């Protein structure tokens, strides 16, 4: 997705992980907030969501709870108290195009911040002065969205980086998106401790 229209795909009733992060598609660049990644073979959540998009690569510093860099604050303000982790890896080889893949967009501005998990696809010319904007397209009002410039000539910060912010949460409804429990052999006759699935 374009981050201005970011997907929020639910993940549900299946085995969650982070070990897969070290195999055929290991992350270039990654962060967690409020939790250690090691627990993602242990914990379980009611809901998980792939908040999925691309960024201008420098937004790795912006996409943080509490960090309030305006483009995020107009495209996807993460909850400023959220606890969790985020894919954000370089995708220049993929998403940049020779003439330039000028189809990944961000809201440049809005009349307010986004709230946590808000999405705004108001598309009228944003007012900044007076009178209804009515296509004035450059004085009182300006069109609020802009494409990223994704091209191989882009310096690394400007390059595309592919993002899945991983929202996950717990409710009165029981947890089901759970990390894999481990396994051990069927030793017999010896006196042992055991955990047969509880």
């Amino acid at each position, epitope marked *: 997705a374009s981050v201005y229209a970011w997907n929020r795909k639910r993940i549900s009733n299946c085995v969650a992980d982070y070990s897969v992060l070290y195999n055929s598609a290991s992350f270039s660049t990654f962060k967690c907030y409020g939790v250690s990644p090691t627990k993602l073979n242990d914990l379980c959540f009611t809901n998980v969501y792939a908040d999925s998009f691309v960024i201008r690569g420098d937004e790795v510093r912006q996409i943080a709870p509490g960090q309030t860099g305006k483009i995020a604050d107009y495209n996807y303000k993460l909850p400023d108290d959220f606890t969790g982790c985020v894919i954000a890896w370089n995708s220049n080889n993929l998403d940049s195009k020779v*003439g*330039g893949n*000028y*189809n990944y*967009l961000y809201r*440049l*501005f809005r009349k307010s911040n986004l709230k946590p998990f808000e999405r705004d696809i108001s598309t009228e*010319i944003y007012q*900044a*002065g007076s009178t209804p904007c009515n*296509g*004035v*397209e*450059g*004085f009182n009002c*300006y*069109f609020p*969205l*802009q*494409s990223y*410039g994704f*091209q191989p000539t882009n310096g690394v910060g400007y390059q595309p980086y592919r993002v899945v912010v991983l929202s996950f949460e717990l409710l009165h409804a029981p947890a089901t998106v759970c990390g894999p429990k481990k396994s051990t052999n069927l030793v017999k006759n010896k006196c042992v401790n055991f955990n047969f699935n509880g």
Partner: antibody, heavy 123, light 112 residues
Framework: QVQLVQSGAEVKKPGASVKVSCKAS????????MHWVRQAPGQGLEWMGR????????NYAQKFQGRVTMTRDTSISTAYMELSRLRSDDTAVYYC???????????????????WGRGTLVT | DIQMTQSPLSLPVTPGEPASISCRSS????????????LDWYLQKPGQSPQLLIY???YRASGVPDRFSGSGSGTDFTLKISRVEAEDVGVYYC?????????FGGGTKVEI
């Protein structure tokens, strides 16, 4: 290298319509509005209009509306201007003109014009 | 739309020496909303669409023709030319983009 290169020759005697085009280079096409300007044997510089390419939005000078429209392809990083009818004396050095998006918030200095453009004697 | 009277018709500067072009205008180019002016000068080149002369009725273009300098407010366009090179033969323009539609100025030519 940054450039924006026009359609080549158009030459015909009057009364048919025309479409004129100009293709960017170097720069992110959405990073600039394209504007279209033309020569007059009198005044020289004359402005017809602007494309917000990312929106596709347009605005136009009162002199031209009924004939004129202008449009773009962002995927082809290329801009178009189209006119219902050319007079002999609507022969001009037509310009595609380059205009940066509002990198300055409030955009007034962003609305300096890169009127370097390129001119073509569409005839 | 704003009328943009340029004076002289032809800057007759014998080169080297300093000079000025002026363009009186009827109507506003003070950007007292946002500071500065929405006002630039432009010079149409011999064979080529114009290079920007001056931002904001005062501060120079990125092309460094420091032979030129500018000032004004409200509806004064003053162009002042501190030095003349023989290449400065050309047609100099005030223009408005404070409002849409645009207008181009009457032009001033340069010669000896």
């Amino acid at each position: 290298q940054v450039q924006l290169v026009q359609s080549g020759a158009e030459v015909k005697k009057p009364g048919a319509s025309v479409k004129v085009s100009c293709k960017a280079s170097g720069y992110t096409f959405t990073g600039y509005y394209m504007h279209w300007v033309r020569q007059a044997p009198g005044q020289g510089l004359e402005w017809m209009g602007r494309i917000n390419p990312n929106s596709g939005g347009t605005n136009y000078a009162q002199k031209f509306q009924g004939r004129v429209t202008m449009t773009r392809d962002t995927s082809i990083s290329t801009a178009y201007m189209e006119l219902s009818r050319l007079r002999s004396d609507d022969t001009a050095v037509y310009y595609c003109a380059r205009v940066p998006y509002c990198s300055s918030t409030s955009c007034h200095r962003d609305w300096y014009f890169d009127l370097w453009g390129r001119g073509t004697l569409v005839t | 739309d704003i009328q943009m009277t340029q004076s002289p018709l032809s800057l007759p500067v014998t080169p080297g020496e300093p000079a000025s072009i002026s363009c009186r205008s009827s109507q506003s180019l003070l950007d007292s909303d946002d500071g500065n002016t929405y006002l630039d000068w432009y010079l149409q080149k011999p064979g080529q669409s114009p290079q920007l002369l001056i931002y904001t009725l005062s501060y120079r273009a990125s092309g460094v023709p420091d032979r030129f300098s500018g000032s004004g407010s409200g509806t004064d366009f003053t162009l002042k030319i501190s030095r003349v090179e023989a290449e400065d033969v050309g047609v100099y323009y005030c223009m408005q983009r404070i409002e849409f539609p645009l207008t181009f100025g009457g032009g001033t030519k340069v010669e000896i």
